[PDB]
Enzyme design. Structure first.
Site, short mmCIF file in Angstrom:
data_model
loop_
_atom_site.label_atom_id
_atom_site.label_comp_id
_atom_site.label_asym_id
_atom_site.label_seq_id
_atom_site.Cartn_x
_atom_site.Cartn_y
_atom_site.Cartn_z
N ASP A 21 45.26 55.79 48.31
CA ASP A 21 46.30 55.80 49.35
C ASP A 21 45.97 56.71 50.56
OD1 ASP A 21 49.11 54.75 50.03
OD2 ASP A 21 49.49 56.94 50.16
N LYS A 24 41.18 53.92 52.39
CA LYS A 24 39.80 53.48 52.23
C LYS A 24 39.64 52.02 52.69
CE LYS A 24 39.59 54.90 48.00
NZ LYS A 24 40.78 55.76 48.35
N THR A 25 40.36 51.09 52.04
CA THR A 25 40.23 49.68 52.42
C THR A 25 40.78 49.34 53.80
OG1 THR A 25 39.83 48.40 50.37
CG2 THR A 25 41.32 47.39 52.02
N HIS A 84 40.33 55.60 41.92
CA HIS A 84 41.32 55.53 40.82
C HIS A 84 40.76 55.97 39.45
CE1 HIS A 84 44.43 53.26 43.08
NE2 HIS A 84 45.20 53.38 42.01
N1 LIG Z 1 51.62 55.36 58.73
C1 LIG Z 1 50.34 55.14 58.22
N2 LIG Z 1 50.21 54.41 57.10
C2 LIG Z 1 48.89 54.22 56.78
C3 LIG Z 1 47.70 54.71 57.41
N3 LIG Z 1 46.55 54.28 56.76
C4 LIG Z 1 47.02 53.49 55.76
N4 LIG Z 1 48.44 53.41 55.73
C5 LIG Z 1 48.76 52.43 54.56
O1 LIG Z 1 48.38 53.05 53.27
C6 LIG Z 1 48.23 52.03 52.20
C7 LIG Z 1 46.95 52.14 51.31
O2 LIG Z 1 45.86 51.40 51.89
P1 LIG Z 1 44.45 51.46 51.09
O3 LIG Z 1 43.64 51.54 52.37
O4 LIG Z 1 44.28 50.36 50.06
O5 LIG Z 1 44.16 52.62 50.16
P2 LIG Z 1 43.08 53.14 49.24
O6 LIG Z 1 43.23 54.65 49.46
O7 LIG Z 1 41.83 52.42 49.61
C8 LIG Z 1 43.40 52.62 47.53
P3 LIG Z 1 42.25 52.39 46.13
O8 LIG Z 1 42.65 53.67 45.41
O9 LIG Z 1 42.56 51.16 45.31
O10 LIG Z 1 40.82 52.24 46.61
C9 LIG Z 1 48.38 50.66 52.98
O11 LIG Z 1 49.84 50.46 52.99
C10 LIG Z 1 47.94 51.07 54.45
O12 LIG Z 1 48.48 50.13 55.42
C11 LIG Z 1 47.89 55.55 58.61
O13 LIG Z 1 46.99 56.02 59.32
N5 LIG Z 1 49.25 55.70 58.92
MG LIG Z 2 40.62 50.40 48.63
MG LIG Z 3 51.24 60.32 48.47
#
Ligand SMILES: Nc1nc2c(ncn2[C@@H]2O[C@H](COP(=O)(O)OP(=O)(O)CP(=O)(O)O)[C@@H](O)[C@H]2O)c(=O)[nH]1
Ligand SMILES: [Mg+2]
Ligand SMILES: [Mg+2]
Ligand SMILES: *C(=O)[C@@H](N)Cc1ccccc1
Ligand SMILES: [Mg+2]
Ligand SMILES: [Mg+2]
Ligand SMILES: [Mg+2]
Ligand SMILES: [Mg+2]
Ligand SMILES: [Mg+2]
Ligand SMILES: [Mg+2]
Ligand SMILES: [Mg+2]
Ligand SMILES: [Mg+2]
Ligand SMILES: [Mg+2]
Ligand SMILES: [Mg+2]
Ligand SMILES: [Mg+2]
Ligand SMILES: [Mg+2]
Ligand SMILES: [Mg+2]
Ligand SMILES: [Mg+2]
Ligand SMILES: [Mg+2]
Ligand SMILES: [Mg+2]
Ligand SMILES: [Mg+2]
Ligand SMILES: [Mg+2]
Ligand SMILES: [Mg+2]
Ligand SMILES: [Mg+2]
Ligand SMILES: [Mg+2]
Ligand SMILES: [Mg+2]
Ligand SMILES: [Mg+2]
Ligand SMILES: [Mg+2]
Ligand SMILES: [Mg+2]
Ligand SMILES: [Mg+2]
Ligand SMILES: [Mg+2]
Ligand SMILES: [Mg+2]
Ligand SMILES: [Mg+2]
Ligand SMILES: [Mg+2]
Ligand SMILES: [Mg+2]
Ligand SMILES: [Mg+2]
Ligand SMILES: [Mg+2]
Ligand SMILES: [Mg+2]
Ligand SMILES: [Mg+2]
Ligand SMILES: [Mg+2]
Ligand SMILES: [Mg+2]
Ligand SMILES: [Mg+2]
Ligand SMILES: [Mg+2]
Ligand SMILES: [Mg+2]
Ligand SMILES: [Mg+2]
Ligand SMILES: [Mg+2]
Ligand SMILES: [Mg+2]
Ligand SMILES: [Mg+2]
Ligand SMILES: [Mg+2]
Ligand SMILES: [Mg+2]
Lengths: 392, 205, 85, 61, 82
Positions: A21, A24-25, A84
């Site tokens: 969260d 990354k993706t 994760h």
């Molecule tokens: N307000 C705000 N929300 C954000 C920002 N970056 C991401 N979010 C949201 O955070 C969430 C997590 O996205 P994700 O990029 O999958 O996370 P991850 O950390 O890769 C998860 P995994 O642990 O499976 O690899 C999505 O809802 C994304 O749109 C940001 O700069 N600002």
């Molecule tokens: Mg990811």
């Molecule tokens: Mg948190």
RNA sequence: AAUUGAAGAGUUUGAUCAUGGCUCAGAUUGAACGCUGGCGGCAGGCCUAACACAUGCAAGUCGAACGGUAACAGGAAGAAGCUUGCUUCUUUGCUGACGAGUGGCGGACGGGUGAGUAAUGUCUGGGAAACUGCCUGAUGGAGGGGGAUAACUACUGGAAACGGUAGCUAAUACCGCAUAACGUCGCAAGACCAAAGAGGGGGACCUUCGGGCCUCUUGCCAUCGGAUGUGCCCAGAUGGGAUUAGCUAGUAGGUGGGGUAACGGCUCACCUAGGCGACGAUCCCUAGCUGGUCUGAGAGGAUGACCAGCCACACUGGAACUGAGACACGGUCCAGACUCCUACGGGAGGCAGCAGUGGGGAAUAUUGCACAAUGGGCGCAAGCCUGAUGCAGCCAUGCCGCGUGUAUGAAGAAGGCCUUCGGGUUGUAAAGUACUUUCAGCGGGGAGGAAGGGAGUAAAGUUAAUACCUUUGCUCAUUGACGUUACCCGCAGAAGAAGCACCGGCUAACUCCGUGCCAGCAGCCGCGGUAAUACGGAGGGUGCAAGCGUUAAUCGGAAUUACUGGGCGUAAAGCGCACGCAGGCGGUUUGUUAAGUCAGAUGUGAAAUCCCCGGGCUCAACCUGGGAACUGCAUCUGAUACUGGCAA
RNA sequence: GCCCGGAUAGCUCAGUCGGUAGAGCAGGGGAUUGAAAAUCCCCGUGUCCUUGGUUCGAUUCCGAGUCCGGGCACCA
């Protein structure tokens, strides 16, 4: 597949890592979108990366998806990773090819328990140049704590002996940039700069007898088995008789076809993370962990010698030494073969902090060679690191 | 294919001196013959009906150095020709090129003759032949090919054939190294110590 | 399927519209005779027969009717009216 | 029902294996033999004679 | 349509065509009316190698057999003079 | 020259002889599995799910049929730079050629698969009630006109697929008229029926200067033939079950109409009430058939992979069209199931073609090269196409050949094993020594598969012609996927190449140790209970050998389905007895017929395979010429003993 | 690759709700026998699937790993 690969740029492997969260993706989607403005054919969307139904529903990337984009200097093969804990297997495999990651750390939560584990593993596998990216900067604007987060991040890199101070920290909102907010859009391009600068054009061993570790076996609809891999040494052309050596009895095949990112490629060569089509090898036959090599150059083993360094308990490692017969998990190139430790004489308890050595017998015959560096994990944390000292 | 093992042990099993290691020496005398086929060789066998037929097949086969699959074919070839199944079986073994080279005296042993034919040093009618299983037709001339002519092995072996029978059916020059294979070998001229009758009794069943 | 010889598809359909028109007109002259036989008019039937004769025979030349089918129509239809006339 | 030849094995309630014909005549009703060396069934440990049967590979050294 | 043509028999790399009279709508080694002669392209400088029964062949030419050019090349080679 | 060919053993019993099964020794296979593994040659390679299929390719071709020219290259008028002929360059079907279109031909062949089919099929031998493009023979024609249409334009629907409306134009496209005959109809008289033009060259003449005219090639129409192919009919043969005995109602036949290329309940209306059946109908299960393959002394038994003939099918069910031929693999229409695209209106697809994928399975291969050769389609030809075919790839799957070395060598070593501890054994095996170098590795040479085709030239036909064309020779440059070919020479070095099963009897070859009815072995009899030639290891030996064993399968031995060639008192087997229909068999004499039988002859019995004598790949496997054979069948001509019919 | 279960002597099973592991059938051992059966006189005969932490102490608490079973995803 169609449309042959046009070899013009140096191929560098990079990829996001960090706590869940932190973006990354989203960043990986964000990069390809912004880079599409300086590059005609690209723009993998967010759902294009998280296409797996669990990734769709649960909303977590659990499968390292390989995307690509390019600054008109280099060629980037980006490997997104699953921050994760229970999905370490995938992270390692991705970080194994990682020639410089993009550490994503949110301004919101600062350093996290999993960011700590990634860096540790990044160091273990040997991810050299870590770019950092302060995401969710749109969230907070208090430049004081922005600098305090930026401080604490360098602090972690510090104790993990990466050059923390001279490490590029890029602020920015991976999210907002994805829609096209010109403001935060530039921040992406700012990391693109360190992406070409901070990381150099790596050393390759193209003249070596070809070798290819196998990260993921595919069953292409109509063509057969496609073994994915970054060529560690040598090159390969379609038709070259290769044969599999690994955790089961060695078979023989032939590179009936070589590709990269669905773009046909007649000749693969060291460092390139290509997919190889094989001559009539069923799915249950070839599987992850086995190595893909030029005939007779390498054969499996289950006995050797090495070294071990146990880091402290407040850094992961151990706090209670182990005796004889302790069997950990050996991670080398793409595996986790569990093996028994044959300790040297009188060694009752191997105290956490030594840099002595040991001998091993394991359960799966594997492609070895003296000088083969390998991690040694156990129970959600690394315990030791060691290189093949000598064949026993 | 070839036996290529302890080739005098075979003579101890069959009992007779099968000329496998005839060589430069005149009489073997150094193999503790007749009383030692192996560890329990001091003992006498039961030697049943199948035993005498088998040994008679081996003795003939060990001499000409043929293998079973190929020896079975010679019988099947002799069984379909006219005349007599036993006699024609020996006429086929007496026509082999590696046997001729031995009979012509160009080589010491049948294995050395096989070594000579195989290493392209034997020519028939002006044609180079490698096959030791070449069936020499009647009225043909065989000779050592010019290049490997009289090279330390043929000379000593050709002198050795002076102390042999020097068969009737085939004439040899002995000077220009060119033997002349006339009509097919008659039974009254060949071995005679062996029995062709028992080989047919083995392949009949 | 995809063959450039899908021309035979439309060419035969262009021909079946033509051949049907000729087999249609051939049968209308043949049935014209049987209309005159049911009426028992040996003059009217002879009229239609002397009018359907060239029509039924020119089709033998065009390869439509197998010349034996046409010859069979001239055979029995004559055998019909000569029993009537 | 099939017989398991050779001293010692590792078959347990599952593990797909291969079956060849041939009665035993020691057990009333057993007419097959499992092929040691084929499928998920490992060969006999420490054979030195008749190892084509019993699925034992020739010693490395 | 009857045609006087060859028929690829023999082993690999060693052909042996048998000039035969068959219907043109059949395989090379298919049903034939009657075989008439043969043609060994790589026989040897020996006693034999090519025979064509020119009397039976000439009978089918009068019947309407369309001789192939490869066979019509062989009618020249077995000379109608020598 | 062309079958010169036939075996037995173990096991019931204390022992024997019978009866009687079980098992083994042989050969073979589209084989699978385990261990092992050097090469070459020639063959074979989805036996299961006729399961579902991504991608590419498997049937195109002719400008010498026609309107055209959208491309590419020239010719030509002109154009612009500028070295005024160096180029830039817009028009232009005017030539070479050629997308899209009309038209002709092919697409019904070739390739695949074996689901269906127990007779509608196949095999064998006959038959008449038929048709037959391309090919070819003989005899004649090949006259004169018209109306449209695609392409192409304008507009326009539709995401695409795919069209729509109104005009323009051509033909070897289409429709007449004339003309008809040994053609069709009709007893006959009579009535009626066809067609197409292009292309090369050219003297005289002729030209509205398009071209006519002469000439040669080719194609078109008609008719009867021949050949090939196909459709149809009949007879015999062609699996198991009676725990399937009655089956059928266009069903059996007749009459008339219609229909098919053709005969016919093929189909209708009426009439008769038949027809098939114990010499097996109907029903059920299984199955493509054959030439042949394996086995066998033979007779038979099993079988139908590869090669070849015939049939059947093309996602499932059904139908018809075009055409010489299909009721059509890569065609159409419709319905259905399942996948796929969608702009949600509507469309697309059918690997049982070559590869390849998933699946199923004990198990079966490359998303290769080339059209050089053979064959096919089209074309005047050149050529284009050809996943047919020719080759290469992969696999020891099979058959065949070769190699892994040769000679010498006693201190008869060491080590291992055994031992009466003397010694024996491994074993001339090794080492040592003298030589050779096959096939692999490396570097040079190098056939044959190639025939034709193209350009030129001369002569002979042709003709008005030295022209065009055709034909036979000659000349020049050439056409090879395999292919770094086969094969030859050269260089180095014993150098890179030996396992597998068995050793109680059957059945070739034995001891020691460990384990003690445990662990385990086993084709059959059976071993193992503290002295195991049977278990596990070791030594030695035997068989076979780049293979060896195990399993499965067929036949053999098995005279254990007995026609050749067995049995029934007591071993398995005489119905409890009798009368008796069909059936089988039937005394004796003469004559006759000639169904059975026999002899002779003719036709056929596809080729391959098998067999015999030869020929060619260094031999062999393999290929291959001739012959025999194909033991069968049909018709005709004779014989008349025996059987049958007939008469007394 | 993900998630969810199962694994306790030679065999079949009880057991925890952190406290130093059981039952029965078999097996091994002496007398008897040629060797067993039966009868008589005796011994659990366990890496709790493996391994490392949490603690004095882990079968029982929490993580990695192995074999298996069931469901699910991925497609150069
Ligand atoms: N307000 C705000 N929300 C954000 C920002 N970056 C991401 N979010 C949201 O955070 C969430 C997590 O996205 P994700 O990029 O999958 O996370 P991850 O950390 O890769 C998860 P995994 O642990 O499976 O690899 C999505 O809802 C994304 O749109 C940001 O700069 N600002
Ligand atoms: Mg990811
Ligand atoms: Mg948190
Ligand atoms: C195929 O694209 C490979 N060259 C790279 C890759 C992409 C995604 C997943 C695995 C391998
Ligand atoms: Mg969440
Ligand atoms: Mg061999
Ligand atoms: Mg007894
Ligand atoms: Mg099949
Ligand atoms: Mg497809
Ligand atoms: Mg065109
Ligand atoms: Mg066909
Ligand atoms: Mg529209
Ligand atoms: Mg016309
Ligand atoms: Mg008439
Ligand atoms: Mg006209
Ligand atoms: Mg009628
Ligand atoms: Mg009928
Ligand atoms: Mg009728
Ligand atoms: Mg069937
Ligand atoms: Mg087949
Ligand atoms: Mg059909
Ligand atoms: Mg259909
Ligand atoms: Mg199908
Ligand atoms: Mg078709
Ligand atoms: Mg198809
Ligand atoms: Mg296929
Ligand atoms: Mg497959
Ligand atoms: Mg399977
Ligand atoms: Mg094509
Ligand atoms: Mg000694
Ligand atoms: Mg060589
Ligand atoms: Mg030539
Ligand atoms: Mg040549
Ligand atoms: Mg020429
Ligand atoms: Mg014996
Ligand atoms: Mg044994
Ligand atoms: Mg003992
Ligand atoms: Mg023993
Ligand atoms: Mg019999
Ligand atoms: Mg039998
Ligand atoms: Mg009897
Ligand atoms: Mg009785
Ligand atoms: Mg009675
Ligand atoms: Mg009676
Ligand atoms: Mg008669
Ligand atoms: Mg007769
Ligand atoms: Mg024949
Ligand atoms: Mg020869
Ligand atoms: Mg004959
Ligand atoms: Mg009588």
């Amino acid at each position: 597949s169609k449309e042959k690969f046009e070899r013009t740029k140096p191929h560098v492997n990079v990829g996001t890592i960090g706590h869940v969260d932190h973006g990354k993706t989203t960043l990986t989607a964000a990069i390809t979108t912004v880079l599409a403005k300086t590059y005609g054919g690209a723009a993998r969307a967010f759902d294009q990366i998280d296409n797996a139904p669990e990734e769709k529903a649960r909303g977590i990337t659990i499968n390292t998806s390989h995307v690509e984009y390019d600054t008109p200097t280099r060629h980037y093969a980006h490997v997104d990773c699953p921050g994760h804990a229970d999905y370490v297997k995938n992270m390692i495999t991705g970080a194994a090819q990682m020639d410089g990651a993009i550490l994503v750390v949110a301004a919101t939560d600062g350093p996290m328990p999993q960011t700590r584990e990634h860096i540790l593993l990044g160091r273990q596998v040997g991810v050299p140049y870590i770019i950092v990216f302060l995401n969710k900067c749109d969230m907070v604007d208090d430049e004081e704590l922005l600098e305090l987060v930026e401080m604490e991040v360098r602090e972690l890199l510090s104790q993990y002996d990466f050059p923390g101070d001279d490490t590029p920290i890029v602020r920015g909102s991976a999210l907002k940039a994805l829609e096209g907010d010109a403001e935060w859009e530039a921040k992406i391009l700012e990391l693109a700069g360190f992406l070409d600068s901070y990381i150099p054009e790596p050393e390759r061993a193209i003249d070596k007898p070809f070798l290819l570790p196998i990260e993921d076996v595919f069953s292409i609809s109509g063509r057969g088995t496609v073994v994915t891999g970054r060529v560690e040494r040598g090159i390969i052309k379609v038709g070259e008789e290769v044969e599999i050596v690994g955790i089961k009895e060695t078979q023989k095949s032939t590179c009936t076809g070589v590709e990269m990112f669905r773009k046909l490629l007649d000749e693969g060569r060291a460092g390139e993370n290509v997919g190889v089509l094989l001559r009539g090898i069923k799915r249950e036959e070839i599987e992850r962990g086995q190595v893909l090599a030029k005939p007779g150059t390498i054969k499996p083993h289950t006995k050797f010698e090495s070294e071990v360094y146990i880091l402290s308990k407040d850094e992961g490692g151990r706090h209670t030494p182990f005796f004889k017969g302790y069997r950990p998990q050996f991670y080398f190139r793409t595996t986790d073969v569990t093996g028994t430790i044959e300790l040297p004489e009188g060694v009752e308890m191997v105290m956490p902090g030594d840099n002595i050595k040991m001998v091993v017998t394991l359960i799966h015959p594997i492609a070895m060679d003296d000088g083969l560096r390998f991690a040694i994990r156990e129970g959600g944390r690394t315990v030791g690191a060691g290189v093949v000292a000598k064949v026993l | 294919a070839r036996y290529l093992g302890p080739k005098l042990k075979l003579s101890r099993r069959e009992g007779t001196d099968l000329f496998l290691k005839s060589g430069v020496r005149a009489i073997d005398t150094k193999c503790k013959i007749e009383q030692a086929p192996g560890q329990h060789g001091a003992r006498k066998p039961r030697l049943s009906d199948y035993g005498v037929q088998l040994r008679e097949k081996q003795k003939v086969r060990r001499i000409y150095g043929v293998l079973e699959r190929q020896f079975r074919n010679y019988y099947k070839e002799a069984a379909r020709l006219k005349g007599n199944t036993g006699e024609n079986l020996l006429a086929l073994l007496e026509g082999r090129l590696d046997n001729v080279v031995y009979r012509m005296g160009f080589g010491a042993t049948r294995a050395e003759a096989r070594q000579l034919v195989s290493h392209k040093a034997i020519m028939v009618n002006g044609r180079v032949v490698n096959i030791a299983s070449y069936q020499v037709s009647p009225n043909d001339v065989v000779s050592i090919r010019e290049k490997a002519k009289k090279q330390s092995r043929v000379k000593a072996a050709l002198e050795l054939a002076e102390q042999r029978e020097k068969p009737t059916w085939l004439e040899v020059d002995a000077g220009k190294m060119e033997g002349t294979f006339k009509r097919k070998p008659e039974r009254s001229d060949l071995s005679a110590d062996i029995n062709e009758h028992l080989i047919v009794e083995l392949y009949s069943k | 399927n995809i063959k450039s010889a899908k021309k035979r598809a439309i060419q035969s359909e262009k021909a079946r519209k033509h051949n049907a028109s000729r087999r249609s007109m051939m049968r209308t002259f043949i049935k014209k005779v049987y209309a005159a036989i049911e009426a028992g008019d040996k003059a009217a039937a002879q009229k239609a027969f002397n009018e359907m004769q060239p029509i039924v025979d020119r089709q033998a030349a065009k390869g439509l009717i197998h010349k034996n089918k046409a010859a069979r129509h001239k055979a029995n239809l004559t055998a019909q009216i000569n029993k009537l006339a | 029902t099939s017989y398991i030849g050779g001293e010692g094995h590792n078959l347990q309630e599952h593990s797909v294996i291969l079956i060849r014909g041939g009665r035993v005549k020691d057990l009333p009703g057993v007419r097959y033999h499992t092929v040691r060396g084929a499928l998920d069934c490992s060969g006999v440990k420490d054979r030195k004679q008749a190892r084509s049967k019993y699925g034992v590979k020739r010693p490395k050294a | 349509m009857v045609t006087i043509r060859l028929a690829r028999h023999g082993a690999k790399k060693r052909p042996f065509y048998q000039v035969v009279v068959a219907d043109s709508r059949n395989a090379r080694n298919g049903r034939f009316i009657e075989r008439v002669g043969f043609f060994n392209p790589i026989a040897s400088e020996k006693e034999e190698g090519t025979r064509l029964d020119l009397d039976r062949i000439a009978h089918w030419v009068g019947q309407g057999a369309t001789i192939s050019d490869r066979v019509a090349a062989l009618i020249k080679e077995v000379n109608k003079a020598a």
